[PDB]
């Protein structure tokens, strides 16, 4: 079967070979299962790749929906490093959508859960993202 790792490999090739919509559908299906049964690292990398493909396809609101869905799940899985990456990419998409207020909210909520989990590297990571928000 095509687990998360196999779907990532197929999608990277299809994207590079000019087939982004087919790369998108491969990851959409894999992410759907990983959100219920996959581990936080599998969720993170499926979601950040799928979201970025959607972003450059010109579907940024779909990119946000993917990152937001993964973000909600990862907030409960106890892995502060996974929370950092997903919140970073979600906040950046929210910025690119013209919604910096929600980008801040996402990062502030990630920071609060990371502080509760206890991981100073993940906390310094999200703090730095909150600082570097002065961009467009």
């Amino acid at each position: 079967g095509t687990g998360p790792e196999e779907a990532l490999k197929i999608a990277l090739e299809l994207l590079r070979r000019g087939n982004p919509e087919e790369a998108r559908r491969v990851l959409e299906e894999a992410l759907e299962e990983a959100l219920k049964k996959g581990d936080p690292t599998q969720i993170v990398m499926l979601a950040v790749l799928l979201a970025d493909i959607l972003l450059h396809l010109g579907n940024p609101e779909e990119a946000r929906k993917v990152l937001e869905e993964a973000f909600r799940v990862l907030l409960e899985l106890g892995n502060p490093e996974a929370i950092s990456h997903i919140a970073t990419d979600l906040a950046k998409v929210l910025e690119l959508l013209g919604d910096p207020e929600k980008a801040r909210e996402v990062l502030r909520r990630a920071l609060k859960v990371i502080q509760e989990l206890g991981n100073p590297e993940a906390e310094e990571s999200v703090r730095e993202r909150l600082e570097k928000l002065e961009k467009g």
């Binding site: 998360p4 790792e5 196999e6 990532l8 490999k9 999608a11 990277l12 690292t41 599998q42 993170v44 990398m45 950040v48 790749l49 970025d52 892995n79 490093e81 996974a82 950092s84 990456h85 970073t88 990419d89 950046k92 590297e121 993940a122 310094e124 990571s125 999200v126 730095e128 993202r129």
Partner: protein
Amino acid sequence: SEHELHDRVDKLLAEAMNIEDPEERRRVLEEARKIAEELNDKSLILAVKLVEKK
């Protein structure tokens, strides 16, 4: 340029997730780490570390 560099890291990390040869996997993760530490972006560095641990 920073977003392009972040994308490059994310694609290298996605690739490493399925690589079977351990030395090939290390090299790809080192390519990702190289970019992330050159950017000195803590979130991107931590993104590499998350995948290195797996």
